[PDB]
Amino acid sequence: AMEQLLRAELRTATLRAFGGAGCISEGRAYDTDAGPVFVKVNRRTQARQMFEGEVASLEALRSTGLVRVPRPMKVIDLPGGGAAFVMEHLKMKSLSSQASKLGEQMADLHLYNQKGSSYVDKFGFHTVTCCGFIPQVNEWQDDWPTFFARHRLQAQLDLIEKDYADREARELWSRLQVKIPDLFCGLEIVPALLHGDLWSGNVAEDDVGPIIYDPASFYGHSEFELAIALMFGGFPRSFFTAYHRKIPKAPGFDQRLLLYQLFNYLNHWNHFGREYRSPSLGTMRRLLK
Amino acid sequence: AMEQLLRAELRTATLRAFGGCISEGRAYDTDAGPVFVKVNRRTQARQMFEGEVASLEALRSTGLVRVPRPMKVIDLPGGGAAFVMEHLKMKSLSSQASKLGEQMADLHLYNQKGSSYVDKFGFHTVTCCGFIPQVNEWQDDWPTFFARHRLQAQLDLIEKDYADREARELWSRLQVKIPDLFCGLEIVPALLHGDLWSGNVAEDDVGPIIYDPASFYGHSEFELAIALMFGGFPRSFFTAYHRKIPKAPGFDQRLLLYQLFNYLNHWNHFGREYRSPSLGTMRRLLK
Ligand SMILES: Nc1ncnc2c1ncn2[C@@H]1O[C@H](COP(=O)(O)OP(=O)(O)O)[C@@H](O)[C@H]1O
Ligand SMILES: Nc1ncnc2c1ncn2[C@@H]1O[C@H](COP(=O)(O)OP(=O)(O)O)[C@@H](O)[C@H]1O
Ligand SMILES: O=C(CN1CCOCC1)[C@@H](O)[C@H](O)[C@H](O)CO
Ligand SMILES: O=C(CN1CCOCC1)[C@@H](O)[C@H](O)[C@H](O)CO
Ligand SMILES: [Mg+2]
Incomplete structure (x- = not known):
C-alpha cells in the first residue's frame, strides 16, 4: 500500500515514517531534575476527565504486564481551564521491525x-x-x-x-x-x-x-x-x-x-x-x- | 505560566524542552530528502490537492514568502490521493x-x-x-x-x-x-x-x-x-x-x-x- 507506492513514485530505497505533537492535545517532552517526562496539554473544560480516562487505561494495560506503555505520573488542573497530563517519556520510533x-x-x-x-x-x-x-x-x-x-x-x-x-x-x-x-x-x-x-x-x-x-x-x-x-x-x-x-x-x-x-x-x-x-x-x- | 506550574508540581529546577493528523497524513525520511505526505481518501482529493499546488505555486512565484515546494500528486488505489511536498522542520510562529x-x-x-x-x-x-x-x-x-x-x-x-x-x-x-x-x-x-x-x-x-x-x-x-x-x-x-x-x-x-x-x-x-x-x-x- 502507501509505503510501496511512495517508494515507487519517488524512486527511493528507504522510507522511514517519523514524528508540539498530537491530534487532540499539545504534547511536549521536557528534561527534568529526575529525568525526562512527556506532557500533554488540553485547554478544554473536559480535559481532566479525558486524561483521567487515559490514566485508568494506561494503568489497566500496565497491570497485565503484557505490553509496554508509559507510566502515568500526574494530572494537573491549569489556571484558565483545562489540564496537563505528565507521563513517563519514552524514546520511540515508528513501528517496523517489532x-x-x-x-x-x-x-x-x-x-x-x-x-x-x-x-x-x-x-x-x-x-x-x-x-x-x-x-x-x-x-x-x-x-x-x-x-x-x-x-x-x-x-x-x-x-x-x-x-x-x-x-x-x-x-x-x-x-x-x-x-x-x-x-x-x-x-x-x-x-x-x-x-x-x-x-x-x-x-x-x-x-x-x-x-x-x-x-x-x-x-x-x-x-x-x-x-x-x-x-x-x-x-x-x-x-x-x-x-x-x-x-x-x-x-x-x-x-x-x-x-x-x-x-x-x-x-x-x-x-x-x-x-x-x-x-x-x-x-x-x-x-x- | 504552565512551565512554572510544571516545575512546581514536578519539583524540578530544570525543565528544558526537547524533541521539538487533523486528517492530514504523515512524514517520511527519503533517500533524496525528508518529505511530507498528505493523504486524503475522498474522491475529490485530487482536485483539492491540485488547488493547493496551484496556490503554493502562485505564492512561490512571488519569492516573498517561504512555502513548502510541491512535489507530486498521486492517485491512490481505491480512491483519493497523496500529495508529496518538501519537508520543513518547523516550530510555532514566535520570534519570526x-x-x-x-x-x-x-x-x-x-x-x-x-x-x-x-x-x-x-x-x-x-x-x-x-x-x-x-x-x-x-x-x-x-x-x-x-x-x-x-x-x-x-x-x-x-x-x-x-x-x-x-x-x-x-x-x-x-x-x-x-x-x-x-x-x-x-x-x-x-x-x-x-x-x-x-x-x-x-x-x-x-x-x-x-x-x-x-x-x-x-x-x-x-x-x-x-x-x-x-x-x-x-x-x-x-x-x-x-x-x-x-x-x-x-x-x-x-x-x-x-x-x-x-x-x-x-x-x-x-x-x-x-x-x-x-x-x-x-x-x-x-x-
Ligand atoms: N510517553 C511519551 N514519550 C515520548 N513521546 C511521546 C509519548 N507519548 C506520545 N509521544 C509523542 O507524541 C505524539 C502524540 O501523542 P498522543 O498520545 O497520540 O497525543 P494525542 O492524543 O493528542 O493525539 C506521538 O505520536 C508521539 O510522537
Ligand atoms: N511541508 C511540511 N513539512 C513538515 N511538516 C509539515 C509540512 N506541511 C505540514 N506539516 C505539518 O502538518 C501539520 C498540518 O499541515 P496542513 O498543511 O495544515 O494539513 P491539513 O490540511 O490536514 O490541516 C502542520 O501543522 C505541520 O506540523
Ligand atoms: O481547519 C481550519 C481552521 N479551524 C480549525 C478549527 O478551529 C478553528 C480554526 C482551516 O483549514 C479552515 O479555515 C476551515 O476550518 C476548514 O478546515
Ligand atoms: O486521532 C486519532 C487517529 N486519526 C487522526 C486523524 O487522522 C486519521 C487517524 C486517534 O487518536 C482516534 O481514533 C481519534 O482520532 C482521536 O480523535
Ligand atoms: Mg492546515
Missing part, C-alpha cells in the same frame, strides 16, 4: 481476560474513557452487540444528529440497527481488554520491542481493536499474521470489520468534520446491501 | 512574527506593484478553504465576488443542509447593506494565502513559513480575519503588517464581514457549534 512482536502481544492482551486470573464477564469499563474529545459511556452490559450499538454507534450518531442534523445518517442508522445481530453469526463473544485506539500513530518501538500509548480502554470484542489499525494502515502485514495465528478470524469477521470501521468514521466525522460524512454513509450502505 | 507581517504585506502589494497586474478578483482554478471547493470565477467588483462566491455559496450550503430560517432571514437583510462597507475606497486585487490561521504558519531558524494555502485574488484585509478571530499570532505580526498596509477606514466593520465568512465555513465543515457565532456576527453587522 510489528510481529506487537501482534503477539496484542493477541495475548485480548486473551488475558480469558486465560489469566481475570474475571470480567461483562463489556464496558469501570470509568469513563474518552474517544478523543468525546466522553464515552462504559456502563457494563452482558451483551456486546447491545453495548456497541448503544454506547458507541448510537452515541456517535446522536452527536451527528445534534451537530449536523443529517437526514441520511438518521435513516441509514435506523435500518442498520435492525441488521446488527445478524453480523455476529451466533457467536459467543468474550470480553477482551482493549487498548481502544490502536491507530498506527499510537504504536511505536524502541530497541527492547514495541510500545503502545494514548489508549482509550474498555472490555470489548477483540476484533474491534483491529478496525482502526486496518482502516488507516501503517501496520506491516506481519502484525496481523502474528495476531491471527493466536486469534483466528471468527466467521463474519469481514462484515463486522465494516461495522467497527463505521464507528471510527463516525468518530472522525464528529472530531474532524464533514470530510468524514461520505465514508460514514458509504459504510452503512455497504452493510445494508 | 514581525518578519512574517512584513512578508504578508509585501505579498498583498505584489500584484498592484508588479509588471503583470491581475485586474479582477478570483483565481484561475478552484481552491479549497479546508475541504469544501470554492468558486473562483473572475469578477471586476470585490463586494460582488465576496457576496456571491463566498458568503452566498456558504449560505446556500447551509440552507441545503440545515434549512436554517434565521440564517436565511438575516442574509436577506444583510446582503443589501454590504456596499456601505466599501463605498469611497479603492480595492485592488491582492494575492492571498487564503487560510492564514495560526495553525497554517510556523517558522524555522531561517524565517517564517506558511502552508496549506487556499489562494485567490481578494481584498488584502480578508487575509487577516481568520488570523485575528482564532488568535495565535503575536501582536508584532500585525504591527509589522499595518506599518506597510495601514487599516483603511471602516476596517473593523469589514473585519466582521470577513470573519462571518469564516464562521459560515466552519458551520458547513464542523456543524452547529458554529451556528451561534455565524448568526450573532450577522446581527452585529445589522445593528
